[PDB]
Ligand binder design. Structure first.
Ligand code: NI
Ligand code: NI
Ligand code: NI
Ligand code: NI
Ligand code: NI
Lengths: 129, 197, 196, 130
């Protein structure tokens, strides 16, 4: 079943646009937020849009984007932090700690400019509707 | 001439309509209004009056900061909270939606970065550690690379399972150790490497 | 209840206490006030009542916006301006310090965006412009890269302003500069004429 | 010539170079590290240094103001007297990018990349020592 990936910082849902751009909304009605979490191994996930079937990805500069071909840049490490929120790192650029995020306004937040103590990396899986 | 019906004095602070949080948290809702006479404020849970006694722990209100506050939030609190600012010239209202989520019990959690890798000259005594946070006692086992060296409850105690020792190493001991922990909700696990010198 | 002593309704706008500006400019001081009954507002120049007849061109007030406006400020405006908001339950006040600055004598100044680059087909007539503002008639000369024209005896100021180039050639293509100066300093901006 | 103060219209502060090497803005006319000393190499080029920590205002490769003790390439600013009679200072080195010296309304340095011609953050006026 699908879940939404609500970010605490702004309180937006994680979205992948047909335009392949990765932002964040608040429109519970929006279709491009109804994410589909899938796991390779345990702790490794694939988040794809149940609409444009796009796989959340992060290129070599730490920039979230919607690709249509599931690949190395689509592998994220889902983790439940002590505070009970979820934090997703880039398998690929994991060594540095490039988390998925969003700035207080609902826009992707460059992997490099991000960090552990940030409310931008914390997510919550909420029901469909 | 000096009349004035309620107006918002800080729209950016009301931007976040949906409040989704882990239970036990504290939540604050704000409705910064302006107006003359100074407007009054009241809060509504799902439409009707939100009596203090309507939730364990009650709720605080900070009129000087136009806010409502609920501590140690619980699943029962889920709902719609609406403020209602008013004076004799009119009123304004806003509505926040709160979704509190009970996340425990959950899979065991391993403090990131651990176990820490290591390396030592043949004959030396290396050490490995696995810290696991849990509201219970998690099943934890050490796996060598298949051999399961230690296991919580089996051969080593809990206090003992936290630290995997390896006295008088060798070039054989060179490999990928693993910390596997878990419960009925699931498991977590992190590896480390022992480089023999 | 309905008793309310004057309060600041917008502390932000009041952040800037020191207002330093070029002479001639128009300054505005604001003191957004709240209070029931509605407070009243009055201004004070250097501690005393700032009466309209205290400066040339008096001053406008905006009750709606709790402000004071002074147009074409002069050095004689230098001072502290204090607003006093008050009603029967109390009063509040803020003070702004105004420092008007005569920037003259200063180097010439060239109207930004001039000279404007150009480009034309061989045969036509290209043009270049340089407008300069200075306390005294500015010494201005066009420099093609040799000194083309130069304001002096045979070239007047209104003439020097615009540099014409009739029936161009591929040789005229290059960097035309407008250099201007006075006893205090000099400034200069270039422009490129591309030949087609 | 003599020591001047570089007042920024935006928030209404004096440019300031801290012993720390950090560049910010104060409102204290008495503060010491605001007594700047403008010196010009070529005409149009300048060096702003504290007549105390003898530090020269500078901008690194990411447009970030800092106090230097060794006058260097990142110390040269292009002094320009604008049409409205305020001064704007640009990084000689990063000039291509149009990275001006600036202060946010709270009196804190403004990173070059996030500054522009239209901002009141970049407008200064030299004022008397006292
Ligand atoms: Ni709900
Ligand atoms: Ni827990
Ligand atoms: Ni069990
Ligand atoms: Ni003064
Ligand atoms: Ni002038």
């Amino acid at each position: 079943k699908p879940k939404l990936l609500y970010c605490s910082n702004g309180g937006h849902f994680l979205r992948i646009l047909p335009d392949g751009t990765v932002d964040g909304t608040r429109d519970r009605s929006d279709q491009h937020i109804q994410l589909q979490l899938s796991a390779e191994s345990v702790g490794e996930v694939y988040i794809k849009s149940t609409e444009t079937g796009q796989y959340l990805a992060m290129d070599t500069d730490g920039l979230l984007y919607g690709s249509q071909t599931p690949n190395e840049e689509c592998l994220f490490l889902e983790r439940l932090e002590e505070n009970h929120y979820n934090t997703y790192i880039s398998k690929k650029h994991a060594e540095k700690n490039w988390f998925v995020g969003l700035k207080k306004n609902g826009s992707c937040k460059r992997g490099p400019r991000t960090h552990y103590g940030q409310k931008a990396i914390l997510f919550l899986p909420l029901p469909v509707s | 001439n000096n009349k004035r019906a309620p107006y918002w004095t800080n729209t950016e602070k009301m931007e976040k309509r949906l409040h989704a949080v882990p239970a036990a948290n504290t939540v604050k809702f704000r409705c910064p209004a302006g107006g003359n006479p100074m407007p009054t404020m009241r809060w509504l849970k799902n439409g009707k009056e939100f009596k203090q006694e309507h939730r364990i722990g009650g709720y605080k209100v900070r009129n000087q900061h136009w806010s409502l506050i609920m501590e140690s939030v619980v699943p029962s609190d889920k709902g719609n909270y609406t403020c209602v600012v008013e004076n004799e010239y009119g009123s304004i209202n806003h509505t926040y939606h709160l979704d509190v989520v009970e996340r425990s019990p959950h899979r065991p959690i391993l403090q990131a970065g651990l176990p820490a890798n290591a390396s030592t000259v043949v004959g030396g005594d290396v050490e490995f550690v696995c810290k696991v946070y849990s509201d219970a006692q998690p099943h934890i086992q050490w796996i060598k690379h298949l051999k399961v060296l230690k296991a919580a409850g089996v051969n080593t105690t809990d206090k003992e399972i936290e630290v995997l020792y390896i006295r008088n190493v060798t070039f054989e001991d060179a490999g990928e150790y693993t910390c596997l922990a878990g419960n009925s909700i699931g498991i977590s696990f992190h590896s480390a490497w022992l480089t023999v010198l």
